Amino acid sequence: EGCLEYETQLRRQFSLQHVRVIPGLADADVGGRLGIGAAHMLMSLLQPQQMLAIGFGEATMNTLQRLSGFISSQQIRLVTLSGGVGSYMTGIGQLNAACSVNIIPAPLRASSADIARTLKNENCVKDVLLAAQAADVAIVGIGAVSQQDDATIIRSGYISQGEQLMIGRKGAVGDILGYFFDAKGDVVTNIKIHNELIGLPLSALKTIPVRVGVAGGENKAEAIAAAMKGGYINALVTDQDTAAAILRS
Amino acid sequence: FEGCLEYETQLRRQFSLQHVRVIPGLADADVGGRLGIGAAHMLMSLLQPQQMLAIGFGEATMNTLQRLSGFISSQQIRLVTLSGGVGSYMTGIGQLNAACSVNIIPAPLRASSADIARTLKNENCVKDVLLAAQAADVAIVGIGAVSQQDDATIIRSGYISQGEQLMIGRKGAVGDILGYFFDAKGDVVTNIKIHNELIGLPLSALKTIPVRVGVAGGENKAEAIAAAMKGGYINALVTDQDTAAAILRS
Ligand SMILES: CC(=O)C(O)(O)[C@@H](O)COP(=O)(O)O
Ligand SMILES: CC(=O)C(O)(O)[C@@H](O)COP(=O)(O)O
């Protein structure tokens, strides 16, 4: 298996604690094979009654659906890392028998930094932000500037195409929870979406001890590498082709 | 010469309701459960495939929703929230689909100031859901009562304080829908700050939705349920025998 070998190299080069590389060769159902792979990794990492913090987007929602039965049975508590309420869970498949679900009551992005700060200070939002920063495990997707128009953050209308082009001009390669960072994994400073986001910042996300990124696609390799170099994730679930590309870059 | 069938009739004609269901009072059979079943069954006969249902806040509406999820799924019903108060929506909004359409106001039920509330009402993501909610075909809400004191959902969920509830009572209010409190005649009370801090649809807008089901029981809610019908906030009711009887002697 090329996959064990890729797992070993990624694990060594990025000093990861856990890695799964999925045969991404050459089958055309990767969005779902990823969610399966991250669900399995999360099943091995969470003990009963622990708390799992969840991120925004496609790979994490897809992962969450796979994990719904493990969630009830092991009584895992869920908490949202970001605003963007409806996009979450919204059905999701349920749970219960003492399984809490804690949701930031706010959009992902406010229209101004002033309003973002106000919302962050509301009690119902502060309470969930604290919970999230206290989780045992986090699961997040990673977005890439180079996806341009396919990016979830563009297709949800959370940023404009103009914003994305300036974000790229400014040196960003990728994002986690809407926060964008450069090739060395540092969060880019002069970007106004950052102060408009309602959720946990990246510097707080790193308090969570096990942080799993699920992301594939060759156009994400640069972004995923920079996320590992920044330390925002310390475990990775991806596919072979993406794994290859990450290593070369 | 009076059981549930005549209560239904009397209620229908006293308050000019289009649909009413009064469930019999039993030994200890949990009305909250049987109210949800009754209201679910009422919504099943009223919603057509692909129509949009607006959902209120609280226990009777969540109990109803859970009983209604197979019908929501098979009939492709769209759901939309009438109020903020999001993770609370989950009970509920869980156990669903996801061949869905669930529109949720991404905001809390009550903001900590009227300015903050105005600001949230004007964010795009909220404004769009508010519009959608006012255009629903059918609404399902609960009715709260000031007489319930500390057992009211709005106290147990921490959305108002005890002092607030006392002052609200002193100002003449007898009940609420969606956190808007009204007096015995069904008029929204004037000098109440929570009103300007609520994020959801107001009561005057709720009246645009053509079929509005209230679901509510217990003798302590009788005066509130009556006021809600005199206000016109609901035009269909699901309740239990004893409650229906106390209401008729309002
Ligand atoms: C918006 C955001 O958080 C992201 O970091 O841009 C995620 O959407 C990326 O995940 P995905 O490509 O799986 O949707
Ligand atoms: C808070 C609110 O909107 C309300 O009208 O008081 C509802 O909670 C009342 O319904 P319930 O007693 O079923 O929870």
UniProtKB/Swiss-Prot annotation, chain B:
GO terms for cellular component: cytosol. It is found in: Cytoplasm. GO terms for molecular function: carbohydrate binding; cis-regulatory region sequence-specific DNA binding; identical protein binding. Disruption phenotype: Deletion of the gene causes a significant increase in expression of the lsr operon and results in accelerated removal of AI-2 from extracellular fluids. Deletion of the gene affects the expression of a number of genes associated with attachment, defense and pathogenicity. It also affects sRNA expression. It comes from the Bacteria. One of its GO terms (biological process) is regulation of DNA-templated transcription initiation. The keyword DNA-binding applies. Changing residue 153 to A: Decreases affinity for phospho-AI-2. Keywords: Activator, Cytoplasm, DNA-binding, Repressor, Transcription, Transcription regulation. Inactivated by phosphorylated autoinducer-2 (phospho-AI-2). Phospho-AI-2 acts by binding to LsrR, which is then unable to bind to the promoter regions, allowing the transcription of the target genes. Phospho-AI-2 triggers the disassembly of the tetramer into dimers and reduces the DNA binding ability of LsrR. Dihydroxyacetone phosphate (DHAP) may act as an anti-inducer and inhibit binding of phospho-AI-2 to LsrR, preventing induction of transcription of the lsr operon. Induction: Autorepressed. Part of the lsrRK operon, which is positively regulated by cyclic AMP-cyclic AMP receptor protein (cAMP-CRP) in the absence of glucose and negatively regulated by LsrR. Transcriptional regulator that represses the expression of the lsr operon (lsrACDBFG-tam) in the absence of the quorum-sensing signaling molecule autoinducer 2 (AI-2). It also represses the expression of the lsrRK operon. Acts by binding directly to the lsrA and lsrR promoter regions. In the presence of phosphorylated autoinducer-2 (phospho-AI-2), LsrR is inactivated, leading to the transcription of the genes. Belongs to the SorC transcriptional regulatory family. Homotetramer. Dimer of dimers. Interaction with phospho-AI-2 triggers the disassembly of the tetramer into dimers. Contains an N-terminal DNA-binding domain and a C-terminal ligand-binding domain, connected by a linker region. This is Transcriptional regulator LsrR. It comes from Escherichia coli (strain K12).
